[PDB]
Design a protein around this ligand. Structure first.
Ligand SMILES: COc1cccc(S(=O)(=O)NC(=O)c2cc(-c3ccc(C#CCO)s3)c(OC)cc2OC)c1
Ligand SMILES: [Zn+2]
Ligand SMILES: [Zn+2]
Length: 563
C-alpha cells in the first residue's frame, strides 16, 4: 500500500502544505482517502447548422448541443481465477507468435503530438521536459514512482505528458504494431476501419452457430479487477531487458496502485485503489477476448463450476484452447468493451456464472436473465453502428455502416473548443461533409447536405480538426483530393471483399438505401420541410458563401441526379 504510493502522496502534500488537511467527512468508501487541498465548450458549428435547416426543429438533433466510479467489484472465485490465468497465458502466446514486443520512442511520441508549458507541442520541443521524463524513468527502473498521478476530469482520467510517454514507451507497441489487428488476434478489429467492420460481421455470420450476441457491459472500466490487471501484466513475460522492467513498472506502480486527484465541492482529494481502468484500448480488448472465450467455454460445458476447477477440468480447458481456441476467437469481433460473438450454439445465452463472477455484468438486463441474440448480422449493434448490404447497379455488393441520422447531423453541428475563426469552422464542416460522402453516402439527406457543405466552403480549403476520436476512424476524408477518387480507393481498390476492381465513374453509380430503409434510419425524405430544403439548396449554399466572402467555390450539387 503506502510503500508504492507514498512517494507520490508526499510530493503533493509538500506542494500544498499551506492548504493540506484530512477531511473527516469525505464521500469515499472504495477509494483510500489520504488528504485534501484548496483549489480553483459544446459550441454550435454555424456553417453545418445553416446548411441543415430542417433539423432546427428536430429535438433529437437540437438537444445534442445543449462519482459513479466509487464502486467495489468482488474478488472472483478460485475457479474463475484459474480460468482467467489459463486463458490469459494462452492468449498472450497466440498474440506474440508473429509479433515482437518493443519500446516506443520519443520520436514516435513526438510524431504523435505533432498531429494527434501550455501545450504538448510546447513541452515536447523543450529539453527540460525530457529531463523530468528521465528522472521519472530512472525511478521506475528501481521500482519507484513520483509523478505518475491521474487527474480525474463517464470520467476521463488525465495524466501528465511524461507519465503518458512512459506508459506509451512501455506499452505503445500493442497499438503501434497492431497486436489486436484481426490478422494477429482473430477476434480483434484494430486498424480495420468502420468500412471493414460490416464485412467482418458478415464473415462471422457465415459460421455455423447460434444467434449473434452483442451484450454491453455496464461500465466496463470500473469492472476491471486486480485479477484482470495481473492477467494483462503477463505480457511482460514476453519482453526482455530494459523494456521488461519499464513495462513491469507501468503495471505495478501506475495500474495496480494508482494515485488519483479529483475536485470536490473547492478541495482536491488525493485518493488511491488497486483496481479499475483509467477511462488502454489494447488491454480492454485483451481482457474482453479472454472473458468472451471463458463464456464460450461455459456454454460448451468445458467446466461445471466457478467455485473450483477439478483436476481433470483444468486439463479439459487447456485441451479446448489448443484444439479449438483459435476457431473460437474467429467467432468474435471485439473492440475494447464492444463485442459480437457467434458461439457454437445458443447454450451461450444462459452461460452467465463466469461472466458475472469476473465482474463483467451485462447492461440493461437482469443478472441471471438469458441473453437475447440477433438472428441477422445486419441487425447486430457494433461500435454504435449497424450495417446494411447494398447492391450496386453493376451487381457488386457493398457492406455499409449506418446509425440513426439524427445522431450524425447532431454531431456535425457541434464544434468542440473555443476561439474558432469562420474559416476553421467552415473547414471542420467540410471534414464532416467528406466523412459523410465516404461512409454515409447511402443516406439521401447526408449525400445532399455533404454536397451543399462542399459547395459552400472554398474548394481548396483544407478539412480541419477531427470529426471523431474513434480508433475505427482512418480519416480518409481529411484531404483536398476529389472524394470520388477517395471513394474508389476505399470501397473498390483497397477493399479485399471487392473482387471486381472496375472503378466507379460518377457518384450517380453509387447507391442509396431503399427509400423506406432510409426513413427507418432517420431520413427526413418525404417531409415538406425536407423537400423545400432540397429544392432551394442553392439559396442556403449562397447564404454561407456570402458570409465566408469572395472566395473560389465549386458547385458539387450537379454530381447528384436531381441537380
Ligand atoms: C465513443 O463515444 C463518443 C461519444 C460522443 C461522441 C463521439 S464522436 O462523435 O467523437 N465519434 C462517434 O460518435 C463515433 C464515430 C465513429 C466513426 C465515424 C467514421 C469512421 C470511419 C472510418 C473509415 O476510416 S469511425 C465510430 O466508428 C465505430 C464510432 C463512434 O462512436 C462510438 C464518440
Ligand atoms: Zn511514475
Ligand atoms: Zn441504417
Amino acid at each position: 500500500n503506502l510503500d508504492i504510493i507514498g512517494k507520490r502522496i508526499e510530493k503533493i502534500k509538500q506542494e500544498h502544505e499551506t492548504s493540506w488537511h484530512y477531511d473527516q467527512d469525505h464521500p469515499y468508501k472504495t477509494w483510500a482517502y489520504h488528504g485534501s487541498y484548496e483549489t480553483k465548450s459544446s459550441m454550435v458549428n454555424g456553417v453545418v447548422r445553416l446548411l441543415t435547416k430542417p433539423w432546427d426543429v428536430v429535438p433529437m438533433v437540437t438537444q445534442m448541443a445543449m462519482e459513479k466510479v466509487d464502486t467495489r467489484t468482488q474478488e472472483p472465485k478460485e475457479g474463475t481465477k484459474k480460468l482467467m490465468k489459463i486463458t490469459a497465458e494462452w492468449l498472450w502466446k497466440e498474440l506474440g507468435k508473429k509479433k515482437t514486443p518493443r519500446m516506443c520512442t520519443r520520436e514516435e511520441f513526438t510524431r504523435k503530438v505533432r498531429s494527434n508549458w501550455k501545450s504538448a507541442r510546447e513541452a515536447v520541443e523543450d529539453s527540460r521536459f525530457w529531463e523530468l521524463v528521465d528522472k521519472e524513468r530512472n525511478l521506475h527502473l528501481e521500482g519507484k514512482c513520483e509523478t505518475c498521478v491521474y487527474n480525474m476530469m463517464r470520467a476521463i482520467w488525465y495524466m501528465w505528458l511524461g507519465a503518458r510517454f512512459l506508459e506509451f514507451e512501455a506499452l505503445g507497441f500493442l497499438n503501434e504494431d497492431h497486436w489486436f489487428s484481426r490478422e494477429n488476434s482473430l477476434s480483434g478489429v484494430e486498424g480495420e476501419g468502420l468500412h471493414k467492420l460490416g464485412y467482418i460481421l458478415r464473415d462471422v455470420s457465415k459460421k455455423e452457430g447460434g444467434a449473434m450476441y452483442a451484450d454491453d457491459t455496464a461500465g466496463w472500466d470500473t469492472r476491471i479487477t486486480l485479477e484482470d490487471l495481473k492477467n494483462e501484466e503477463m505480457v511482460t513475460n514476453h519482453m526482455e531487458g530494459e523494456h521488461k522492467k519499464l513495462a513491469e513498472a507501468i503495471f505495478k506502480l501506475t495500474y495496480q496502485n494508482k494515485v488519483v486527484r479529483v475536485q470536490r465541492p473547492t478541495v482536491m482529494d488525493i485518493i488511491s485503489r488497486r483496481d479499475q481502468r483509467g477511462s488502454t484500448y489494447g488491454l480492454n480488448t485483451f481482457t474482453n477476448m479472454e472473458a468472451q472465450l471463458i463464456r464460450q467455454m461455459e456454454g460448451e460445458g468445458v467446466f461445471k463450476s466457478i467455485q473450483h476447477l477439478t483436476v481433470t477440468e483444468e486439463i479439459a480447458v487447456q485441451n479446448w484452447l489448443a484444439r479449438v481456441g483459435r476457431e473460437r476467437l474467429s467467432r468474435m469481433a471485439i473492440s475494447g468493451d464492444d463485442c459480437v460473438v457467434k458461439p457454437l450454439d445458443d447454450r451461450f445465452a444462459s452461460a452467465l456464472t463466469a461472466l458475472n463472477d469476473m465482474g463483467k455484468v451485462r447492461k440493461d438486463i437482469q443478472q441471471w436473465e438469458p441473453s437475447r441474440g440477433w438472428n441477422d448480422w445486419t441487425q447486430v449493434p457494433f461500435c454504435s453502428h449497424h450495417f446494411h448490404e447494398l447492391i450496386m447497379k453493376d451487381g457488386r455488393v457493398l457492406v455499409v455502416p449506418c446509425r440513426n441520422q439524427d445522431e450524425l447531423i447532431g454531431r456535425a453541428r457541434i464544434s468542440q473548443g473555443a476561439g474558432w475563426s469562420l474559416r476553421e469552422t467552415a473547414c471542420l464542416g467540410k471534414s464532416y461533409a467528406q466523412m459523410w460522402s465516404l461512409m454515409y453516402f447511402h443516406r439521401r439527406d447526408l449525400r445532399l447536405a455533404a454536397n451543399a457543405i462542399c459547395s459552400a466552403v472554398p474548394s481548396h480549403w483544407v478539412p480541419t480538426s477531427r470529426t471523431t476520436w474513434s480508433i475505427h476512424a482512418k480519416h480518409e476524408w481529411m484531404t483536398t483530393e476529389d472524394m470520388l477518387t477517395v471513394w474508389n480507393r476505399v470501397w473498390i481498390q483497397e477493399n479485399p471483399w471487392m473482387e471486381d476492381k472496375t472503378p466507379v465513374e460518377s457518384w450517380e453509380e453509387i447507391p442509396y438505401l431503399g427509400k423506406r430503409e432510409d426513413q427507418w434510419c432517420g431520413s427526413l425524405i418525404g417531409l415538406t420541410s425536407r423537400a423545400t430544403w432540397a429544392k432551394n439548396i442553392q439559396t442556403a449554399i449562397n447564404q454561407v458563401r456570402s458570409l465566408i466572402g469572395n472566395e473560389e467555390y465549386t458547385d458539387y450539387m450537379p454530381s447528384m441526379k436531381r441537380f
